[model samples]
Target: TVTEPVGSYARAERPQDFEGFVWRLDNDGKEALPRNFRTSADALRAPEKKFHLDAAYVPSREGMDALHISGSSAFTPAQLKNVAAKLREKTAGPIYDVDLRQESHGYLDGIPVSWYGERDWANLGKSQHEALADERHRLHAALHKTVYIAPLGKHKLPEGGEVRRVQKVQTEQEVAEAAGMRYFRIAATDHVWPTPENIDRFLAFYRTLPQDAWLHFHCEAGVGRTTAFMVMTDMLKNPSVSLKDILYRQHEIGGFYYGEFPIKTKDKDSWKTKYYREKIVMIEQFYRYVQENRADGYQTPWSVWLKSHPAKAL
Candidate 1:
């Protein structure tokens, strides 16, 4: 039986709930849910069917002919090389691989938590953790030419909170550079919108890149942060396009909108509602910034425009 949370459309529990159902079926068959329940739920929230090898092309705009988006790579050197080769074959120019995950490289023992379908550490077991840790150390020396570990740091929550300490991972640049890809890292967190300053910094770097270079952006699931940045890029290059149209086009091509708010409810003050609301507002303002600046002869970059028109306080 699939348990539903009353008065809420969100999943009753995290993806870990699926493991319990699987375990029960294997042990006693007491209460079994559909095998695809978790997958279906995740899809409804963030779809990615259009991606091939965890990648897809963002619609090109004037001045930028190629844009690609993808989920986190398998962190192995071979996997990174494979993904790079595939993307290179599809694009017309050099690829600028952008990493948007704020978490350090080995945050999850060098593997993404999403690989196991549990958001964070909820469903991971001790043995699983140990095996991953072993792999992390092994991969570190193999990829970085040296093993280096940092002190523990607090784990960041999706809802903008921090909890128990976790082992700090190595700087992501080492592995990215080893892959022979020009990598740019943005300090954007997962499951939330980026700060205006970070967005400005990204755009400043983006402006310096050759117009023919294909831009690829990825976070953990390649859903929220990827889509948001892609929208910003579209707005920057094609300021005439409406924000709604840009978002809709991205969604059609498998980019999930992190700013989507849930259905209206009697309780309007929920934190989740506020969280998504802020993102929505931020994107709208960003769209305005792009459109206004473009109309004014593109006199200033986003960073300069931001100084006069400040972003809203969260």
Candidate 2:
């Protein structure tokens, strides 16, 4: 009965997908997917369980290997040195303790992400340092972890094979095949402008994926790039929903990325420049684009907001 244990917590009400679950730490709402493993003696473990499968750890540098810390970028050189020392002793893996520059070699699968200098360009255009920093601030994920940055160009992936990271997204065979992975193209950048192209790449990558292979697509922080990509995917797969509907649905899912926007700033360029103006305009454009991407009859998740706002309609 513990598996279906009665509890005051709604998260407990749903329970994890598996029975006889053992959480290491706070797991109010997270799935034990991709893979779930039996644990060691400590009842107090980390948030995520190590469920390694044939998807064995791909070895690389700290940026390539995996570390396990949060808010890494804000650390100074001294702080990172100490963190790195501790990590070496505590973990069997490497880490990436700083902000990763956008490049071809920074993706997990074939999914594309922010293009080069887009944020800088947007900032320079608007003459807004604050805007640039705002975007840069997002890359503050855990420190001392390994993340694969897909190199741009081509690398042939296994024939008819697929890759997955999380339990949320998938790519169909057509999209998967185009990326061949091992010898596929990697057009990486972190600028805001290439977002549309990145979305296209994601769609193409998803075209040939396995039904159950959900990939975890994240940028520096884990919201902006991933959120944008998901919105486009839903549109491609559904095609009938409005963009507004999608944005509304996402807010319902995880409570909008930035909460409330049209945010105010007090920097030098401070909405006084063209790039900031354009970014402000595009931010809204993105919102509208996602909002209207869903249709009436589709079972698309972004479409769920039609009847519910933030009241747990799901």
Candidate 3:
């Protein structure tokens, strides 16, 4: 799917020299290497740029590093034991065991646990001082640095211009660009927002080495955001991975479901039943941008996944 006019949509913010007119479409939507930007038809054209703010920020030194962690913040230190062990063995990158449960804020496998929205600690406990004191002690117990994002949930209000949404939808690559932090904006946090400036902040650090870097992300029980990132990274690394199955695998990893994100099955007949030919075209468009910008080109298989790994009879 070669890049073409989006008919009714295009990027609104981009960076200079990241110039390219191509726009790729896939199950994850657009990955635009935008050299131009505009908010509306009446808005004046501007030079390439990026989202005004940054979170998930990474430093220059960590470019070749690998980032590691379980999928989502909703985690049990026990449930993530295997994943954590695997992550530690693969890379010495700092491991952050994030969970929202205040009851279990203790050292687990040498990796300290950090809860999201530290402010919420007060709400969850008998007193605000106790919550703050607990968080401080937990930070000391963590492997290294610790931080948390507030208002954890789906940041879905700013649609259409996905790549440019506020810091919550902050791109993985952008974290690298900002020089090293992994920021997660939990799903369904809010329906409306004024700007990303207030909520977003520069990331503190990365848990990986940059060369051949591998970054892992997930959400509670390995569903939702975890699945979204798993699917997103799969497409980024191997376009041949079917998009529909990406969602399927994501659900399996987390042992949960986010409903179906819809799909355009590979078979035209099947694709039609799942999504019209036009819908497939939109997905294909997302692929167009990825190949044009990624260090490697991407390709898709003509295979259909009626249901994901989770759908199978175990």
Best by TM-score: 1
**Backbone clashes, each candidate:** 0, 74, 44
TM-score of 1: 0.56
User: Cα RMSDs of all predictions?
Assistant: 13.4, 21.7, 20.9
Q: Candidate 3 at residue 132, lDDT? A: 43
lDDT of 3 by residue, 75-147 (tens): 2233344444555565555443322222223232322233433222221322324544544454344333333
Q: Which candidate wins on lDDT?
A: 1
Off by over 4 Å in 1: 1-75, 107-171, 258-270, 295-304, 310-314
How big is the positional error of residue 162 in model 2, measured in Å on the Cα after superposition? 37
- TM-scores of the candidates in the order shown: 0.56, 0.32, 0.31
In model 2, the runs with Cα more than 4 Å from the true position are 1-188, 255-261, 268-314
Ranking of models by TM-score: 1, 2, 3
Residue 259 lDDT (model 2): 23
By TM-score, how accurate is candidate 3? 0.31
